[PDB]
Structures are given as C-alpha cells and as structure tokens.
Design a protein around this ligand. Sequence first.
Ligand code: PRO
Ligand SMILES: [Mg+2]
Length: 447
Amino acid sequence: SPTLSESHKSARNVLENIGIKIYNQEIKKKNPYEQQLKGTLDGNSCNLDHLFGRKPCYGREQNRFDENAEAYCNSDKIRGNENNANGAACAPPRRRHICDQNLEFLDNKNTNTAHDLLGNVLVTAKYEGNYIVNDHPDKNSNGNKAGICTSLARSFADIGDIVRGRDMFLPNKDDKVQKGLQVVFKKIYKSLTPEARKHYAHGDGSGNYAKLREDWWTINREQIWKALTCSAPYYADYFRKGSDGTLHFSSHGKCGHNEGAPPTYLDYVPQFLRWFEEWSEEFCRIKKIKIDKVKKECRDEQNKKYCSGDGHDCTQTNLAHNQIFVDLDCPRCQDQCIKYNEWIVKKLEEFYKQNLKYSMEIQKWKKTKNNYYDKEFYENLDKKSYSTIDKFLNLLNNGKHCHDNKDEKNKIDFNKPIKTFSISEYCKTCPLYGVTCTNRGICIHNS
Ligand code: PRO
Ligand SMILES: [Mg+2]
C-alpha cells in the first residue's frame, strides 16, 4: 500500500506536523468577535443548498496533471520572484489553472458581508474540487484514492492563501481576485461592531485587514473544506502520520467531507514549502512515466531490442573495434532520449531555483528581527534538523512518489543532483563489446 507505507519523515508529514502546531497557537486565544466573521449560507452530490458575475473554471486550462504541464518559476507572475535573483518559487500547474474565476467579480454592490464572501468561496471550492477529482491521475484506482485527498488539501491551502492575501501567484497585471477581496474585506470591517473593529485595528486606528482575513479563513475553513470535498470519491480518505509514526486519517470517506474539522493543516504551511513539496512529488511521479516511454523505445530484451542514446543497435555494435551499426528501430531511442534529457534539464534548473529560495527563506528567518505570518513555522523547522538544506532535501527524498524505488541505481536523492537528474540508463552508450540477446528473452553484455 503506497498510502500506508509513506514515510513518517516525508516532507508532507513533517510539514503537516508543524502546521498542526501553528493552527493550535492560532486558535488558542479566544476571539470574542468570531460570530461576526462566521459565514452562514466515484463522487457524490454537490448541491450547495442541500448541505449548507461568472463561474470558477471558465478560461482555465485543464490537464493540470499532464506529464508535460509546466510549472511557472519566472518573475512577472510570482510575487517575490525577480529577474535579479536565481532563487525562485515554482507555481505548480495545479495552482496556475486554479478555478478562481468567480472571485474576479467581488467588487459589486451585492458582495458586502462575511456570508456573501463565504458563498463565493464555497462556489470556488465546489468547482475546484470537481476539477481535481475528475482529472486526478488516481481517478480510476481500485484502492482508497488517498492521492486525490492530498491534491485537494493542496488546493485548499492555495485557496486559503488567496483568501488571506498571502498567495504568491499573479495571474496577470490586473490582480482582480485580490482587488475584489480587499473591497469585500473593507465592507466586512465597516459592518463589524465598534468593539470588533478595534480588535481588528492597528495602533493608529486603521483596519488590520491581514488579521481580519486570517481569522475569517480560520473561522470558515471547515465549511470551505466541506464544499471542496462535495464531489470527493466515497472511497477516499486523507492520511497523515505523526512524528512517532501514529496514523491519522479521515473516517467516513469523501476526504472527511462529513466529519467537521478538516483532516489537513496544509493551509498553515508556508506556500513556497508546499509548492516545492508538490514539485518534488510530481517530478518523481512524472519521471516514472517518462522513463517507461524511453524504455519502450530503447530496451525490449524479449523482442531483442537493445539500443543506445546515440541510436546504435547494441546487438550489432562494438565500440571497442569502432564498429557502429545503426538499424532503423534504434534512431527512435535517440529521439526519446533527446526529449527525456530536455525535460530532465528543465527540472534540474527548477530544482536549483527552489534550492536557492529555500536557503533565502531560512536566511530571512535568521535575520528578520520583526514578525511576519511565516516566522513561527520557520522557527519550528530550525528547532528540528531543517535549517540545513541537506536535511530538508532528505524529506523530499522521503515523499510517497519519491521514496518508491526499490532499485539501488535509480533511487531519488536530491542531495546528489547528478544522480537524480541524469540521463536514463536506457540511453547510455552501448556496452563496449556489444550485447547478445538469446531466444530465452534476456540480453547479456559480451566478453
Ligand atoms: O537568488 C540568487 O540569485 C542569490 C543567491 C542566493 C541568494 N540570492
Ligand atoms: Mg515578481
């Protein structure tokens, strides 16, 4: 079972465990004004009227999970990414095409209360969840589709960052979702009782919109998770492990849709860390798909096919005597190897960029005297071994998709980029003295 065997030291598990502590600190202090921010309105029913302008997925590209769906690591669309810095956060394709379109229509005479905003956010969650569930790579698995619940937790976390104004992705120069949200949140603040207005106020009397949006999220996150999981398959639950290996899980399917408190705390994990963890999992998952396509064009021992990356037929090639034989099937190995190497080269660059950004986020924590929303989280990473990039890279190695390689040669190790981002073994130059393939269906190295 990949679900049950996932390391208690996977980045997802370690980050979720710090996320729990952050969430706990945040809900420790009583907020007397909670109710003023409280909003009142395989797969199953998604009617919002039963269990509680424009639509959410319009204009958005689908195929978010395709092997060639690209991450965005450049500067114009990411806050904090600049052309003068190699260090960069990578917005995953799941984020890039998120179903947030309805939130671009919040600046209107109708959207004025916490209930009006919740309505819109539940509509976003329902649709985003519907897309994830209906296009997920595990949609047709015969096991409990835990993988879908994980992708939903990742979108739930991005939605929370959009709602809170912490999200780093800038879809275009207009920033309509954010501008709409700041208008709705100004109305909500004005609509509060004077005593609540002072609780959400800076020293100078001006509105503390950052704190107001944080508490709004915290207060409504449970209903938002319920909407997000409306279409979640019945036989799908969220699973996570504690530091001691204790298994934590939703109990009634649909990723905890019917259970109240969300089973996830990813919405309390810094966005950059969540994106890098998804980058690594999706890299390892996609790499397996790409290696298999390279193998079908390069090596088929049973059918006497043994090619090299140079398109040589290893069954008729002897590099030691300088005897090269290029048949008509092996040039296709060359073409698949060229294509695989371009993807690997692009992933290596994305990897170094996030590697640098990680160091920068850790350094920002060490040097920052003043407070910020991500400070306590980075304090906790430091308390554990994770101030070292090497210790954080071990967590990426431990991921569900990344750790799953029983073969010693092709084991994922982010601390050894040369081995992790190398050419496929099926692309290596012919063994020196050639290969002999028997009728048995196995090819042996000559001499
Ligand atoms: O991101 C960059 O290019 C440099 C190197 C690490 C800190 N800033
Ligand atoms: Mg930028």
